[PDB]
Amino acid sequence: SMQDPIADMLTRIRNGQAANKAAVTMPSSKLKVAIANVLKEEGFIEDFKVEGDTKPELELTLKYFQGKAVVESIQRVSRPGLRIYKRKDELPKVMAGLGIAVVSTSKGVMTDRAARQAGLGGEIICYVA
Amino acid sequence: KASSXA
């Protein structure tokens, strides 16, 4: 059920770009934004938007290119049914590097490539290709 | 095709 709101993002997004749409909205959650930011910064979506006051709403502007979308794939790693955390060197690398992997660290979220150089580590939110 | 039982 509501149990997992994160894999709801990745799914809505993976599904949105599936049905070649340009904008996908969902209720807003602090962590969600943190992720949103990540995807933007890393160039995986044109950008976020958050016009929610009493009932926080989040919109994501999807990107595209040629005969495909930006995100070749996006999977949930750590879930509420089995949390996964990784050290500094144990941090996972997506597609030999060509692809971020959102890892939350005790000093704010990051990307596998980010946190790596960062020096620390933490739970890994998901896999985006 | 098949032997000793089939």
């Binding site: 049914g81 | 032997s3 000793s4």
Partner: protein, 123 residues
């Protein structure tokens, strides 16, 4: 399926069953040899396969195949059984080693004599 489930009732391996259980799961065994008969194999083939019912050492009595054209075996004797089944005769899950203990190798065999037990005849 689920982790929680696997966490609980954990996955259980499925042990293997030695096609040849004439005990100890050991190389070969010595046996008194109760009877020396000949039987007929399954539908496709039709010979007069030679076999012997042997009283092993560990007490199990079992039927074994006698490979090669002819043998010295009979009534008592004391062969030593090996392994490898005889997909043509069911129940025959063992081969008696040729040219071992009271068993004489195949007379005259010149090819692949290592089996059928025979010694190089005048090189």
């Amino acid at each position: 399926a689920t982790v929680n489930q696997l966490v609980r009732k954990p996955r259980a391996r499925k042990v293997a069953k030695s096609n040849v259980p004439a005990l100890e799961a050991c190389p070969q065994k010595r046996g008194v040899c109760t009877r020396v008969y000949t039987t007929t194999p399954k539908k496709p083939n039709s010979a007069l396969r030679k076999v012997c019912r042997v009283r092993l050492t560990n007490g199990f009595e079992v039927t074994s195949y006698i490979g090669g054209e002819g043998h010295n075996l009979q009534e008592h004797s004391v062969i030593l059984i090996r392994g490898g089944r005889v997909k043509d005769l069911p129940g025959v899950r063992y081969h008696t080693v040729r040219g071992a203990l009271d068993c004489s190798g195949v007379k005259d065999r010149k090819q692949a004599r290592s089996k059928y037990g025979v010694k190089r005849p005048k090189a």
